[PDB]
Design a protein around this nucleic acid. Structure first.
Ligand SMILES: Nc1ncnc2c1c(/C=C/CCCNC(=O)CCCCCCCCCO)cn2[C@H]1C[C@H](O)[C@@H](COP(=O)(O)OP(=O)(O)OP(=O)(O)O)O1
Ligand SMILES: [Mg+2]
Ligand SMILES: [Mg+2]
Ligand SMILES: [Mg+2]
Length: 540
DNA sequence: GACCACGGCGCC
DNA sequence: AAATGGCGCCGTGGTC
């Protein structure tokens, strides 16, 4: 029972706030409160009251900071109990769960949320004293990163709306061509979007063989992998795959994105979720801008809609072979280090092998295929699936996986070391000490145990790569502000920046150097950088 | 209208 | 379909 104290709060108080909706860029600030020294200060008018705060300190601090930036207020986020809980155990992803776990209840009242922020911070800070590596990640990465993400979210990205509107109409007509052809081949119309109705057509009405079953309900699958296997069993299959591609892209990007342009900014605003993944990666939502298409011709057309403001340029930076380089460092494999000290490209070399092509003629689509193979095999792909992936007998695909691992013997050794440690202490960890708890490593069901093992030894690699990118963003942001440039998007190992046209080149050089020297490893980090008027053009 | 599980698929 | 891992969004079918 905190004393009902009057607004303003004293410096350092913990804030609580209620939004009309989860998206800070779209939300109405319904309520604002603060708690400190056994007092609760409830703001009579939330929006005006924002101006009395000098930092957003409490649960979901970034969300409030984004809203303040929207209102032209430079209110940076500070301490956030979610970030403490997430570093302790990244299964701590929601304020509902964190509260129940560390001493409170996540209600819908700013005052209670402010008092909750205060309580949880005390407890969680107590849990994190002595954990000096986690404390370092909090002070030097997550807490400062939240400020960076807040500016990214409030800045947004420009989108060629009219372009996408015109594209929709073009795609609609092609979808009609494909579905009409499907219906003719089926002999009747049906909901081609309903995979249950398609299942009957393909496997009951048509006589096509079923390849596999779905996980939870055991229906005959109609996934792309299955349809690929049936490309020649019937002409309908090809048109179903093309229908799937177009409707996926139209329904997920072409049509939704133009309606999400913010009225005040005229730009598109994602959310970068900071306590959402088991490995330390960020995620992006509402809308997700970390999964904008690129693979197919139409996907590329969609990516072209992401453009720079008039007088500016996009700068796209992407770490080269990042998790392979991270692997070299964690494992210490002398042979894998040599690969990168010699400037070799394993994705291109697998691509050249997969397609029987010299590296000069490996097109980007080939290299993408090689990356699924290379990382698929690394993190535990079966001989069987690989043989089916490469349209190749089981003997060879089985041998590719032995060649692969034989040339880097210290990898399996690191895998085995990582797993034993996880079994013993109950968690695996990144280069910087970010932890993931994987209790199923001692499961008595092999399928469950081996699944947990693949999650366990992936996490140090993926999570270290995520740590490096986070640290680079923290280092790079103030340098960009100095140059009048903007950080717009992060896509796991890629940053998209926006720079004035006359400083774009300078920004690209600087950003590349910051990313490559973020934290020297036993192998060099290389960063591919491009500049263009649109996101596609800026990645070569 | 809001949920949800599921299958499916876009990205890293 | 699958002994790669990590995400979030879509439409369907179904519930409330
Ligand atoms: N599949 C995975 N599994 C696990 N981890 C994965 C991945 C990927 C995958 C990336 C690209 C996937 C491209 N796939 C396609 O577009 C099609 C694949 C199938 C092609 C089939 C051809 C044959 C058809 C029938 O014969 C990245 N990662 C991780 C590891 C990687 O270091 C990190 C950053 O992603 P990227 O920047 O794309 O990759 P890298 O940095 O390693 O490569 P670089 O940046 O291109 O130099 O993200
Ligand atoms: Mg990369
Ligand atoms: Mg990338
Ligand atoms: Mg799912």
């Amino acid at each position: 029972a905190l004393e009902e104290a009057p607004w303003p709060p004293p410096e350092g108080a913990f804030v609580g706030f209620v939004l009309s909706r989860k998206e800070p860029m779209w939300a109405d600030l319904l309520a604002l409160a603060a708690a400190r020294g056994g007092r609760v200060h409830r703001a009579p008018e939330p929006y005006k009251a924002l101006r009395d705060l000098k930092e957003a300190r409490g649960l979901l601090a970034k969300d409030l900071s984004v809203l303040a930036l929207r209102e032209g207020l430079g209110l940076p986020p500070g301490d956030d109990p979610m970030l403490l809980a997430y570093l302790l155990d990244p299964s701590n992803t929601t304020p509902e769960g964190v509260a129940r776990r560390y001493g409170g209840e996540w209600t819908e009242e700013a005052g209670e949320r402010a008092a909750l922020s205060e309580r949880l911070f005390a407890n969680l800070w107590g849990r994190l004293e002595g954990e000096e590596r986690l404390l370092w990640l909090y002070r030097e990465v997550e807490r400062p990163l939240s400020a960076v993400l807040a500016h990214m979210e409030a800045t947004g990205v420009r989108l060629d709306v009219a372009y996408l509107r015109a594209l929709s109409l073009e795609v609609a007509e092609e979808i009609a061509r494909l579905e009409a052809e499907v219906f003719r081949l089926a002999g009747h119309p049906f909901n081609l979007n309903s995979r249950d109705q398609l299942e009957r057509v393909l496997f009951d009405e048509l006589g096509l063989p079923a390849i596999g079953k779905t996980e939870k309900t055991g229906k005959r699958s109609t996934s792309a992998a299955v349809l690929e296997a049936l490309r020649e069993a019937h002409p309908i299959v090809e048109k179903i795959l093309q229908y799937r591609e177009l409707t996926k892209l139209k329904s997920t990007y072409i049509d939704p994105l133009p309606d999400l342009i913010h009225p005040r900014t005229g730009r598109l605003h994602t959310r970068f979720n900071q306590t959402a993944t088991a490995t330390g990666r960020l995620s992006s939502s509402d809308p997700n801008l970390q999964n904008i298409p690129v693979r197919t011709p139409l996907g590329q057309r969609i990516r072209r809609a992401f453009i720079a403001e008039e007088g500016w340029l996009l700068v796209a930076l992407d770490y080269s072979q990042i998790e392979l380089r991270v692997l070299a460092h964690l494992s210490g494999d002398e042979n894998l280090i040599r690969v990168f000290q010699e400037g070799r490209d394993i994705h291109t070399e697998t691509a050249s092998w997969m397609f029987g092509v010299p590296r000069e003629a490996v097109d980007p689509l080939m290299r993408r295929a090689a990356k699924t193979i290379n990382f698929g095999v690394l993190y535990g792909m079966s001989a069987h699936r690989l043989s089916q992936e490469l349209a190749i007998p089981y003997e060879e695909a089985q041998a590719f996986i032995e060649r692969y691992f034989q040339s880097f013997p210290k990898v399996r050794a690191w895998i085995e070391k990582t797993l034993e440690e996880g079994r013993r202490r109950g968690y695996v960890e990144t280069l910087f000490g970010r932890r993931r708890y994987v209790p199923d490593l001692e499961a008595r069901v092999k399928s469950v145990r081996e699944a947990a093992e693949r999650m366990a030894f992936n996490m140090p690699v993926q999570g270290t790569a995520a740590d490096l990118m986070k640290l680079a963003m923290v280092k790079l942001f103030p340098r960009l502000e100095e140059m009048g440039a903007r950080m717009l998007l992060q896509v796991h190992d890629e940053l998209v920046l926006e720079a004035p046209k006359e400083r774009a080149e300078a920004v690209a050089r600087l950003a590349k150097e910051v990313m490559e020297g973020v934290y020297p490893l036993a192998v060099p980090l290389e960063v591919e950088v491009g500049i263009g008027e649109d996101w596609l053009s800026a990645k070569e």
